[PDB]
Design a protein around this ligand. Structure first.
Ligand SMILES: [Ca+2]
Ligand SMILES: [Ca+2]
Ligand code: NA
Length: 994
């Protein structure tokens, strides 16, 4: 709907024939999506440099190869000699092999396309709509929004599509049109039509332009235009299909692409040039042309075999599958180019509340009096699991689960926590999560009672709503709370006067349950409860209790402790002043100590583990909280940022302290800081700036508008899933978890994706290096050639096909988080890595030629045993008194070629096992760690077994079936490529790093 601003609300509603109290019907949605498409810009042609210089180049190669095969195929007819067979089927076999290559290529492309499609499911549903299907609001993808459906927006939301405002539910509606008109000052909107059809967007105060931010309010509207039809879509249409900004890794790959193109081209021309003396050999008929054509067919076949194909598809596959695993672990990465950056993350700046900690007060420790003897006491210390307000957790004694009912003291402890409490627990059915009802420190007691369950109430078959206050209600049905003595700051405690429920004894059984600061309460305790009995409070006992309370509040955990006491014989209610808080302390005297609870704001799941993972990975972790310096440090010590006993005077700063520092000192601070407490929202940008001045790949967390500038500036902007949509737009990743652990998991996955690429590159390059070496080794020395054109195409199909692709499905490396963050400035291939290529390649090339010369030079149970000159083999028909019962055509035997081919194929299948990890041993990273690789090896070996033993096949490939003894010779020379790499792995693992 164009010029919707000109028309009224009624006119706009009538345009699509939709009620704003109903929404679009499925028939409407289907048709509208068909006619209008989706709310997005068209994807630009992804024609990378690698495609033209490598892929399109190789395509030309197989065409001129087939042509060169077609040419000699015609020349073969004019050959009056014996009508050959193998050379007659050469163009057929070549095309047949090329067909297989296309099949493997399609499978690779289909893998990538499927893996990309799978990412559309985890697309963040940032858009609320009303449809005819549900009478409530619905969360739908932004691109799935069609012009016509009723959209609801609120505060902190980014406008999905161009929307004509129908009704404003709030008092006012403010929108941020800085991304378009050019002003951060939020504009006010209305529902009246803008009569001028040719008015600027600044005067269109009844429209919600897509991309803009809703500053304040809540309004309802109808979508006018989506996709490129968008006002900002026409602005974004500029850099739509025309741009120039490749990622650092893409630049390295394209650069690496040109390097391969030049090298492969030269070494193949070299092959054709060093064999010009063999153009007139009698095996070529003596024709210079027929000789040059043959070696042309070898060079090009060598090129095809040497060229590492499938790289774009493999990389895209790893990237998409890896991203899915991130989203599977609540890590929603919007843009794929952010992943390589995410894997280079060197510093993580995280918020504490909700991210590092659960922001839900939880009692994790408690102790009661065990035994008292000779004016001394022992304690029963318990630990409680669970870190949320949910009644989910266990009570432990010595790391072993126990029942609270087994301890009479624990029964009274729960009684006090459930009665001396004004708060409660509620289950939000909408959000599907338990929420507190009152003070956090009180709800921690409520949740504790439910976890304890001292009366063993059946709760397993209860609903979430009923479970919330189950055990607490059980206690309240036994004791009736008469009144409550409010908290007083002069005594730092509170108490409740209670009585037995359903009791006719009005003046019998009354108790007072006291809670508050340990020192104050314990000082007013003349007795100590042991089980159900009590004993007089003694010195050593009081000193013992306070010592443990001291340890809990001074130790690494720094627990906020509370004393729980009971007045066994409380004063009469008719003798209590209830309008004077100064009289309450007197009423809370002559108490009996029961126990002590210890609570905190616990770290989220796997956070303490993830923090240690960062230190192992050389990733700095910086906390940004809103607490005081003293507590913030204590929290850092608690979660593992700081040690239990480490100096923190230079690694912890407040907003006040940081602003007192000059620029050079501020920049110096962020270099070593690990904690920032009570900081302005502008400080996050300054922190990022100073971190970037040290070449640190910085990750910053945010949830609101105030964080959006810092989120954009940081390399990895990290927004909260529970946060505003404006922050999500300014971020590179969204936390569905809101958990810090998710960030670390996302970083590890990024490092994993990159490593799979390297092992993919290492296998192909090293193996194909040997393929090139093999051709040159038999040429430089002068040995009889080991490979023919169709055999080269066979190695290309077998070794560069499925086994290569399956390496992308490699599991995360073991030492993946034991290595420092990868520098984006580092080369794609290091010097030592290049050496590893030449090392493995140098062997597989020699082991191939050596296996062929093995049939000639140190022949075992086979014909042709000559340790002498094989160099001048072309002179065998010149000087014959050098053989002994063996023709000169035994040099043309299919036996050494079969050995050379079998070894080359097998030794690369071995090299594939070497590519299961970069530096880790096969002893630590077993071959069965990748099932897809093994299946590819079995398939590749099956094809090789197929060619050698199915009678019509080894004729067209010039091969002969190898004996069981001859095959054991193949493994004998192929397997030691594992050990060679195993040594290289050991060296780099025990010297180059550690
Ligand atoms: Ca190849
Ligand atoms: Ca290969
Ligand atoms: Na950013």
């Amino acid at each position: 709907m164009e010029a919707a601003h000109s028309k009224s609300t009624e006119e706009c509603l009538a345009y699509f024939g939709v009620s704003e109290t109903t929404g679009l019907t499925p028939d409407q949605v289907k048709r509208h999506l068909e006619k209008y498409g989706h709310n997005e810009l068209p994807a630009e042609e992804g024609k990378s440099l690698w495609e033209l210089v490598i892929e399109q180049f190789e395509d030309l190669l197989v065409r001129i190869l087939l042509l060169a095969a077609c040419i000699s195929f015609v020349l073969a007819w004019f050959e009056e000699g014996e009508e050959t067979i193998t050379a007659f089927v050469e163009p057929f076999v070549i095309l047949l092999i090329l067909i297989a290559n296309a099949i493997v290529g399609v499978w690779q492309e289909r893998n990538a396309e499927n893996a990309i499609e799978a990412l559309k499911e985890y697309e963040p549903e940032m858009g609320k709509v009303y449809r005819a299907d549900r009478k409530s609001v619905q969360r739908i993808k932004a691109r799935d929004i069609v012009p016509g459906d009723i959209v609801e927006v609120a505060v902190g939301d980014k406008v999905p599509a161009d929307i004509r405002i129908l009704s404003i539910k709030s008092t006012t509606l403010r929108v941020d049109q800085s991304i378009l008109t050019g002003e951060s000052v939020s504009v006010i909107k209305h529902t009246e039509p803008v009569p001028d059809p040719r008015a600027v967007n600044q005067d269109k105060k009844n429209m919600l332009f897509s991309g803009t931010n809703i500053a304040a309010g809540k309004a309802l509207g109808i979508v006018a235009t989506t996709g490129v039809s968008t006002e900002i879509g026409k602005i974004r249409d500029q850099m739509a299909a025309t741009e120039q900004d490749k990622t650092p890794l893409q630049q390295k790959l394209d650069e690496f692409g040109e390097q391969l193109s030049k090298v492969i081209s030269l070494i193949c021309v070299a092959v054709w040039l060093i064999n010009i003396g063999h153009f007139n050999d009698p095996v070529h008929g003596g024709s210079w042309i027929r000789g040059a054509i043959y070696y042309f067919k070898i060079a090009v076949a060598l090129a095809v075999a040497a060229i590492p194909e499938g790289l774009p598809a493999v990389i895209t596959t790893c990237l998409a599958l890896g991203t899915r695993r991130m989203a599977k672990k609540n890590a929603i990465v919007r843009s794929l180019p952010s992943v390589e950056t995410l894997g280079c993350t060197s510093v993580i700046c995280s918020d504490k509340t909700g991210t590092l900690t659960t922001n839900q007060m939880s009692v994790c420790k408690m102790f009661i009096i065990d035994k008292v003897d000779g004016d001394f006491c022992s304690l029963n210390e318990f630990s409680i699991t669970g870190s949320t307000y949910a009644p989910e957790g266990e009570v432990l004694k010595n790391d072993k689960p126990i029942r609270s009912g087994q301890f009479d003291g624990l029964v009274e402890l729960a009684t006090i926590c459930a009665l001396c409490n004004d708060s409660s627990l509620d289950f939000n059915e909408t959000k599907g999560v338990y929420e507190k009802v009152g003070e956090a420190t009180e709800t921690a007691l409520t949740t504790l009672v439910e976890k304890m369950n001292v009366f063993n109430t059946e709760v397993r078959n209860l609903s979430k709503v009923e479970r919330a206050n189950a055990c607490n209600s059980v206690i309240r049905q036994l004791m009736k709370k008469e009144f409550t003595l409010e908290f007083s700051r002069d005594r730092k405690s509170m108490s409740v006067y209670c009585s037995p429920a359903k009791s006719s004894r009005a003046a019998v059984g009354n108790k007072m349950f006291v809670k508050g600061a340990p020192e104050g309460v314990i000082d007013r305790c003349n007795y100590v409860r042991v089980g159900t009995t009590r004993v007089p409070m003694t010195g050593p006992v009081k000193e013992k209790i306070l010592s443990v309370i001291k340890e809990w509040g001074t130790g690494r955990d720094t627990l906020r402790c509370l004393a729980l006491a009971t007045r066994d014989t409380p004063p009469k209610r008719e003798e209590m002043v209830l309008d004077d808080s100064s009289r309450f302390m007197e009423y809370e005297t002559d108490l009996t100590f029961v126990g002590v609870v210890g609570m905190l704001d616990p770290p989220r799941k796997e956070v303490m583990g993830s923090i240690q993972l960062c230190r192992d990975a050389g990733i700095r972790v910086i906390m940004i909280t809103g607490d005081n310096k003293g507590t913030a440090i204590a929290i850092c010590r608690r979660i593992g940022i700081f040690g239990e006993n480490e100096e923190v005077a230079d690694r912890a700063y407040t907003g006040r302290e940081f602003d007192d520092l000059p620029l050079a000192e501020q920049r110096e601070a962020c270099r070593r800081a690990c904690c920032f407490a009570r900081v302005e929202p502008s400080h996050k940008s300054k922190i990022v700036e100073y971190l970037q001045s040290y070449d640190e790949i910085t990750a910053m967390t945010g949830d609101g508008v105030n964080d959006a500038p810092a989120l954009k500036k940081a390399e990895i902007g990290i927004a909260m899933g529970s946060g505003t949509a404006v922050a999500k737009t300014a971020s590179e990743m969204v936390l569905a978890d809101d958990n810090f652990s998710t960030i670390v998991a996302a970083v590890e996955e990024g490092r994993a994706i990159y490593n799979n690429m390297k092992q993919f590159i290492r296998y192909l390059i090293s193996s194909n290096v040997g393929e090139v070496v093999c051709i040159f080794l038999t040429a430089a020395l002068g040995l009889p050639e080991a490979l023919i054109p169709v055999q080269l195409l066979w190695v290309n199909l077998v070794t560069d096909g499925l086994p290569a692709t399956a390496l992308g499905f490699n599991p995360p490396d073991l030492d993946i988080m034991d290595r420092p963050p990868r520098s984006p400035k580092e080369p794609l291939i290091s010097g030592w890595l290049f050496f590893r290529y030449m090392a493995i390649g140098g062997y597989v090339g020699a082991a191939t030629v050596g296996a062929a010369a093995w049939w000639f030079m140190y022949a075992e149970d086979g014909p042709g045993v000559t340790y002498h000159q094989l160099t001048h083999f072309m002179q065998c028909t010149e000087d014959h008194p050098h053989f002994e019962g063996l023709d000169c055509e035994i040099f043309e035997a299919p036996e050494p070629m079969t050995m050379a081919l079998s070894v080359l194929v097998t030794i690369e299948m071995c090299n594939a096992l070497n590519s299961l990890s970069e530096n880790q041993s096969l002893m630590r990273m077993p071959p069965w760690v990748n099932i897809w690789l093994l299946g590819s090896i079995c398939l590749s070996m099956s094809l090789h077994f197929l060619i050698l033993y199915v009678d019509p096949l080894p004729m067209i490939f010039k091969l002969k079936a190898l004996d069981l003894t001859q095959w054991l010779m193949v493994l004998k020379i192929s397997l030691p490529v594992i050990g060679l790499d195993e040594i290289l792995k050991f060296i780099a693992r025990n010297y180059l790093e550690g």
